[PDB]
Structure formats: C-alpha cells, structure tokens
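Dear all,

This email documents one entry for the complex benchmark we are building for the journal club exercise. For each entry we list the sequence lines for every component of the assembly. Then comes the predicted three-dimensional structure of the complex as a token string, followed by one or two observations. Please use this as the template for your own entries, and keep the labels exactly as they appear.
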Amino acid sequence: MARKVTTRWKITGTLIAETPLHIGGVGTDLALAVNGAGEYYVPGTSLAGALRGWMTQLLNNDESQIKDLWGDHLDAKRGASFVIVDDAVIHIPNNADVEIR
RNA sequence: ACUGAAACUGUAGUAGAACCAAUCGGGGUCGUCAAUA
C-alpha cells in the first residue's frame, strides 16, 4: 500500500503581495528566485517555511503538532510532510517589472 | 544443464539577519562695455 490518506484536500487561491517581495536566489540583493524558465516564482521551500514558521510561533513551538503536519526526518513514526507546497510563478501585473531599492 | 523476483535516493530545513539614499546649499542679485588714432 501507499501512505493511507482519508481525505486529500486541494487548497488553492491567489496570494497577493501586499508589500513588495524579495525571495532570493543564488544567482548584492539583485538576484530574485527564478524557476528554470527564468520566471520569478515563490519556491515551495520558502513558502512552506513561512507557513511552518508561523504555525511554530502559533503553537508555542509544540514540535509534535508541527511535525504531525510538516514531517520529520528523525522520528521513526513520521517522515514526509502531509502538506505539499508547490512552487508558484509570480504574475507581475502589466506595465510593471522588478524594481531596485 | 537455463537471466531471480520485488524495492521512489528519499525524508526534515523560509537565501536570510542587519543598514534612514542620505549630507551641505535664501531662486538670488548693479556697474559699465569697447580700443584705437
């Protein structure tokens, strides 16, 4: 068998930049994260850590509740995350481009 | 004198912390000008 899933939830919507955003990539702070197409994107690793980071502050660092959602490589009962966070291409609106602060 | 079979290199990890695009500056005011014959 696979991992036993009772219900799979597809959880979708539009995240809007309420301030500007910078997610950095390898290649001073003028390199923004780009996917393989060279489009600016949010890496799912960076979005997951934002979401996981918030829940960690919410749950007073109750590690068990966090690892029950986000997974754990160490605990023999846990392993893979039950949240999947996909990569998301950023749609910069028309007549706009990356700015430099 | 007879091919082993079957097995996801995966699992967890926010490219980030810090840094004022800033410092100085009255939109002001008076003596000529020209070189020959």
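Observations: The CA atoms of residues 44 and 85 of chain A lie 5 Å apart. DSSP finds two helices and two strands in chain A.
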